Design a protein around this motif. Structure first.
Motif, short mmCIF file in Angstrom:
data_model
loop_
_atom_site.label_atom_id
_atom_site.label_comp_id
_atom_site.label_asym_id
_atom_site.label_seq_id
_atom_site.Cartn_x
_atom_site.Cartn_y
_atom_site.Cartn_z
N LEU A 100 3.29 17.19 3.51
CA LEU A 100 2.36 16.30 2.91
C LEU A 100 2.60 16.61 1.23
O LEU A 100 2.90 15.58 0.48
CB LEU A 100 0.96 16.14 3.08
N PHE A 101 2.61 17.79 1.06
CA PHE A 101 2.40 18.19 -0.40
C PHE A 101 4.09 18.03 -1.04
O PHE A 101 4.02 18.04 -2.23
CB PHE A 101 1.82 19.49 -0.44
N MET A 160 0.91 -1.35 -0.19
CA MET A 160 -0.13 -0.08 -0.05
C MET A 160 1.07 1.08 -0.02
O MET A 160 1.76 1.43 0.93
CB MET A 160 -0.88 -0.05 1.26
N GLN A 161 0.62 2.25 -1.12
CA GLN A 161 1.44 3.37 -0.94
C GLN A 161 0.67 4.40 0.24
O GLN A 161 -0.54 4.52 0.08
CB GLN A 161 1.40 4.09 -2.17
N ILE A 162 1.46 4.88 1.17
CA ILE A 162 0.91 5.88 2.05
C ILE A 162 1.74 7.20 1.93
O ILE A 162 2.93 7.07 2.00
CB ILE A 162 1.27 5.13 3.59
N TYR A 163 0.97 8.19 1.92
CA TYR A 163 1.39 9.64 1.97
C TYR A 163 0.97 10.25 3.17
O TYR A 163 -0.09 10.13 3.88
CB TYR A 163 0.92 10.42 0.89
N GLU A 164 2.01 10.71 4.06
CA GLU A 164 1.64 11.55 5.13
C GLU A 164 2.43 12.65 5.23
O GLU A 164 3.42 12.75 4.86
CB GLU A 164 1.39 10.94 6.53
N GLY A 165 2.01 13.81 6.13
CA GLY A 165 2.96 14.84 6.52
C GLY A 165 3.56 14.68 7.88
O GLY A 165 2.62 14.28 8.85
N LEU A 216 3.26 14.73 -2.51
CA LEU A 216 2.10 14.39 -2.94
C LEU A 216 1.76 15.31 -4.33
O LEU A 216 1.16 14.89 -5.34
CB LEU A 216 0.94 14.55 -2.12
N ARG A 217 2.20 16.66 -4.34
CA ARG A 217 1.93 17.72 -5.25
C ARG A 217 2.83 17.44 -6.44
O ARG A 217 4.08 17.16 -6.22
CB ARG A 217 2.04 19.18 -4.56
#
Ligand SMILES: O=c1[nH]c(=O)c2[nH]c(=O)c(=O)n(C[C@H](O)[C@H](O)[C@H](O)CO)c2[nH]1
Ligand SMILES: O=c1[nH]c(=O)c2[nH]c(=O)c(=O)n(C[C@H](O)[C@H](O)[C@H](O)CO)c2[nH]1
Ligand SMILES: O=c1[nH]c(=O)c2[nH]c(=O)c(=O)n(C[C@H](O)[C@H](O)[C@H](O)CO)c2[nH]1
Ligand SMILES: O=c1[nH]c(=O)c2[nH]c(=O)c(=O)n(C[C@H](O)[C@H](O)[C@H](O)CO)c2[nH]1
Ligand SMILES: O=c1[nH]c(=O)c2[nH]c(=O)c(=O)n(C[C@H](O)[C@H](O)[C@H](O)CO)c2[nH]1
Ligand SMILES: O=c1[nH]c(=O)c2[nH]c(=O)c(=O)n(C[C@H](O)[C@H](O)[C@H](O)CO)c2[nH]1
Lengths: 154, 154, 154, 154, 154, 154, 154
Positions: B149-150, B1-6, B153-154
């Motif tokens: 996060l960005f 699972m790809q997980i993105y967080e800040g 993510l961005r």
């Protein structure tokens, strides 16, 4: 008559989940539900992208980034809003719902609504894996259906 | 699972704060909270840009200018609305919330919501550095997380 | 920290005022207040453009034309809505507020809100140069500040 | 001070009227009022374009087509909404009002609001040529004023 | 006076129907009504395209795809919202209505509103082929009229 | 003036957490919050020592052992007390609070208080990751601050 | 830890449905739900065997015949009981539930429970494809899961 519909088998489908941290003891149950729905319908866990954000307010801008990815078939928005003493809840719920809906239309991609908007804590608990089901599971199932539909409709 | 967080460390991050003057005895506490949150999470005070505007109504147009700056990673909107005798509050609260949310999506940049929308003065005081915390601190923390996060993510 | 703000001296500033005729006995007091605020803060009366429209509904489309003028620094919207027996008030108030706010963001130019949205006639009178001040004066003062702010921010 | 306003003489002006059929016994009175206002203010009946649609919901999309015509100076929207047992009224009234307002701004052309949004049948009757006037007449008068205004403002 | 209107004969017209599955025991009655209305007004069943989606929330994104088809003259949106214990209904109803209305204006194509928004189950039953008619039949009839109107207006 | 304060970045800091098992469905949420707070502030998970004990009563004696470790910078006490029918709650809450406070002074080391002392189950739920936040997260953030403060103060 | 569970993909699975005729206007919606659930989860309609019986009382004996078939993987029991004036409902509901449960154990084969047992007609409607879902769909989904589980467990 031409009839378009989506099946509920999720083989090959790729999902984005955006989940807020406010009310996490409940959101975390919604996330568990969404993932379980995807996996047991045949989706691979590896094909889920989970993005965490602070609160419901922040869900749309993150969902916008995920929905723009070519390799994401649908986005599932997950959060828990519970009314407080002030109208703060109303303004956040209004904009989170408007944002997600608008993004879905702008990007021509399904974004499903697994955001609880409850008057009470009890109502939130009911909808986060207890007596009124699991809104994460429901929003995931919708996303499966929509992604499959879009394979012919889009 | 790809997980993105800040994460919540703010080293190198650059923030815009837009703060209204109406109800300044309370807004000023929110501003203190936001700045303290940034600085003690490792952000430099020199990397904060503060813009003052008359009222909550004026926050969006100013926030739009700050969010458009390439060297601003996130914008924190700070104001205090307290319901009066007429529905004036409703129309301002609706548009300030809608504007900020819309700008965040249009500009694909986090804009966080540190605007109190209270029915009473007591409720505003509660949320401006007393018993219910400091909404400026909360909106700043959210902005730290979203900016981090960005970065992926961005 | 970078700090941007607007002063309240209006030398050289150019304003558009859009004022509706419905409830003119009150609107006219708001217009008097807006003009006085501008003039006694150092703005020239010659540098005001006043546009009259039938009702609050018509304010946004006229404000859009004024805000688009390169020689207009800010627009002040002035009208008086008083709730009647039906929800007509709600729909007009919602759209006038939405329209003005949206135009401000679209045109990246301050448009201030001097529209009374009252439940009763007494409330409107209170806000049109009596016990609760003059909303035209307040919206003008905001426009002065915003125009000055925008000289560095925009 | 520069002052822009519209006179009420309608010589040479060309109007579009969009009128819904739901509640026609009342809408038809509004249409009579709009036409009479135009003609007796000097507008030619030949220069009116009337478009009929099923319900208030359908007014915006038709008004969008009329407002786009270069030979239409203003559009008058005419319909009658009366609250029923469910919130259906609210959602239709909200969207008809939002649509018309948005189109006016998008197309930079006056679109006036002759849509009754009543809680009761009695209230609708009051506003369709009885004790509270005729909202079609009022919306037409507004369109005359706005079209004349726009001859110098647009 | 120029007068534009749509007749109710549906020969040659092509319709899209988007129907949600939530509350299907009622939605299915609305779908039956819409199809019957089209066919007995002279439209061919072969010229109907039916798209099924999970819930009212998902109707707009699917309607957007159908309305973009050059060989679809109008889209009929069919769903059943019934208020629950929380404000969830309000946020869904608001966005489904907003979305459909916005798409109609964006795509300059009629999209009609056959979505029940009821406070109670009884009210939904009343409007799904019992004492208060069939909202699917009504939305279809509107679409027929609008498609015919657009043959000259668009 | 000499000013001492702790920042909120947790790089290099080492924490002890003592968490009771009574009311584990809630304590486990507090533990999740404490760990997340530490990690996303820059602390390494490897540098957390978690000690489990049966009930709140047993937290102090375990905290005393952890706080005595030279390589533990601060201890976070986590438990959930909910009032029952008898005064049992009062005596346990009194001694758990007295013990922790006393140990902190005796050992000259920060020990923070993430023990919920609720009259009702609903209050406990509110404070364990729902509408009133997460007391584990709060006690962890305090411990970060205190450990950093003590790097200069102790 | 050995973990056994059933996925929700129904490829290759064969189902028996036993559906009573009493209250058929509601049972028929349950049957629609069950079949739709099977087919859109990948089960073939050709692999469904539907048996109709007069009333809930008769469901068990028919279910016993279907469950005994080696080529039936699970049986779904569908009926609608609504309390009348006498305790008749209680005795039927008791025995239909007992019978099905007993048969499942005797035959070591899943038999799922899609029998509504309502105090009121409104409650039955709620559970037959309206506000509280569709009990036939739910019992079918359970049967899919159980049949898959049994492929490894039995
Ligand atoms: O997801 C949320 N659920 C809530 O009930 C809730 N309530 C609140 O009072 C509240 O401020 N928030 C947070 C909000 O979503 C934002 O994160 C916050 O305003 C900072 O932008 C949330 N966020
Ligand atoms: O920030 C505000 N908080 C309030 O409670 C409040 N209440 C009011 O009645 C009010 O007029 N305002 C000001 C408003 O934001 C604008 O500055 C004003 O309308 C001029 O555009 C504010 N502004
Ligand atoms: O400025 C207004 N204030 C009001 O209280 C009010 N009330 C009304 O019932 C009303 O119809 N209007 C007029 C409205 O703004 C428009 O001019 C009219 O609908 C014609 O488009 C106004 N307009
Ligand atoms: O103009 C209308 N006035 C009303 O009061 C009213 N009420 C209703 O319940 C209603 O459905 N309508 C119809 C509506 O405008 C649309 O024509 C219909 O939804 C089909 O799209 C109208 N339309
Ligand atoms: O069409 C619907 N009618 C309803 O009454 C209703 N109520 C609900 O609580 C509800 O969640 N929905 C579902 C909603 O439309 C979406 O499918 C769901 O949120 C997943 O995106 C619906 N959907
Ligand atoms: O952590 C606890 N929370 C409680 O609410 C609670 N209530 C009780 O009645 C209670 O006995 N305990 C347990 C207590 O902390 C001790 O473990 C127990 O007394 C054995 O020493 C706890 N412990």
């Amino acid at each position: 008559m031409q009839i378009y519909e989506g099946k509920l088998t999720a083989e090959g489908l790729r999902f984005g989940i955006v989940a807020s941290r406010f009310n996490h003891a409940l959101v975390d149950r919604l996330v568990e539900g969404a993932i379980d729905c995807i996996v047991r319908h045949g989706g691979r866990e590896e094909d889920i992208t989970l993005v965490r954000v602070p609160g419901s307010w922040e869900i749309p801008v993150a969902a916008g980034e995920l929905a723009r990815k070519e390799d994401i078939d649908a986005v599932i928005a997950i959060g828990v809003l519970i009314r407080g003493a002030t109208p703060h809840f109303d303004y956040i719920a209004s904009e989170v719902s408007k944002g997600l809906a608008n993004l879905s239309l702008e990007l021509r991609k399904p974004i499903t609504f697994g955001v609880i908007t409850a008057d009470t804590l009890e109502q939130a608990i009911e909808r986060a894996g207890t007596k009124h089901g699991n809104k994460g599971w429901e929003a995931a199932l919708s996303a499966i259906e929509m992604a499959n539909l879009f394979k012919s409709l889009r």
